[PDB]
C-alpha cells in the first residue's frame, strides 16, 4: 500500500518517492514531511492512539515518529529491506516484515522482543 | 485479495473474472452484480457504514456503488491500472493506488483532493 | 504478511518456516506450536473473538485451531496452494484465497458456502 490512515481519519501518511513519509490532512494539505531514512520508504502505519507513525524502509530499518515529525526511535536488526510494519491493537508492540521473510516483534520502547520467523 | 467483507459481515464483495464486482450474502447467495467497468476489476472495499462499495479496475478508474448495484461515481485520473482502494476510518476520504506507483486521495463526493505520490 | 495479532493484542500468530504456526504472547514468548500442515504455511488470521486461529498452506488446506493448539477443522477443496485466509467481522464466515485465483467462503462449521470466483 504505502498509505495509512490515522484511526480518526484526520491524518493520512504516505510513503513518498524521495525517502520520506508525508503526512496530509483530510483536505489533501501537506502537514509534515518525516525525514531520516536513507533509502526508499515502502510501508507506513499509525498506532491505534493515533500519536505514533511507523515507517518501513529499504534502509533495513523501521522508524517511529510523532505527528510533529520528530523521530522517536530507529528499530535496527533486519538484514534486508523492510516492507511492512503494523502495530498491535493495544499499541504496545510492533511487527515488522522484511523481504528476506523475517518478521520481528518489537516493543515501542525499541526493544526487540522476538524474531517470529527467519533470521 | 479482491474480496472485502462489509463491516457488519453480512455482505461480501468480490472482484469477478468478468469485469464485474459481485455482492453476496453470508450464506454465499448472490445478491447483485455491479456492471460498468470496461476491464478487469482488481480491488474492492466497503465504506465504514457498509453502504458504499468501491472498485479498482484495470480500466484506470475507481467506481463507487450502492448495495442495490447502482453506480454512484466514477473516479478518473489515474494513468494506469488501479489495484487498490480504501476508505478512511471516518469514511470521508478514499485512497486509490495504481500500478505506476501513484496514490490519489479523494473525498467522498469524488473530488480529487491530492496526488500523494506519483502523477 | 504471515503474522496476525489477536484482537486484544495478547496473542500473536505467525507462519513459521517449518510447516507450523507459532503462537506467541505480547512479550514474544512462545506459547504454542500448531502442527499438522504438510507443507509451508503462508497465511494466518484470528477470529474476531480471538478464540480461533486459521492457517492457510501450500498443502491446499486451511486449518482452524484453538489457543491450546488443538486442531478443530481442516477445510479441503482448493486445488492449489492457499495463501490467504480471513474471518468476517462478525466471525460467521471464513474466506480463503488460493494462488489459482479461487476464493472460497465457508461457515464456521466448515460447510463450503460458495466459490466466489475460480474453481
Numbering used by the authors:
A (entry chain C), B (entry chain B), C (entry chain A): 7 to 125
Please share text taken word for word from the publication where this structure appeared.
Many folds, spanning all levels of complexity (fibrous, solenoid, toroid, and globular), clearly originated in this way. β-Propellers offer an attractive model system to study this process. They are toroids formed by sequential supersecondary structure units of typically 40–50 residues, each consisting of four anti-parallel β-strands. WRAP, which we identified during a systematic bioinformatic survey of β-propellers, was particularly interesting in that its 14 blades are practically identical, having acquired only 10 point mutations over 563 residues (6 of these being Trp → Arg mutations at the same position of blades 1, 3, 6, 10, 12, and 13), as a result of 13 non-synonymous substitutions at the DNA level.
For the 3-bladed construct, SLS data indicated a trimer, as also suggested by our crosslinking data. As we anticipated from their oligomeric states, the 2-bladed and 4-bladed fragments formed 8-bladed propellers and the 3-bladed fragment a 9-bladed propeller. Instead, the packing of the blades within each fragment preserves the geometry of the 7-bladed parent, and the tension due to the mismatch between the number of blades in the assembly versus that in the parent accumulates at the interface between the fragments. In the 9-bladed propeller, the symmetry mismatch is absorbed to equal extent at three interfaces, leading to a slightly triangular shape.
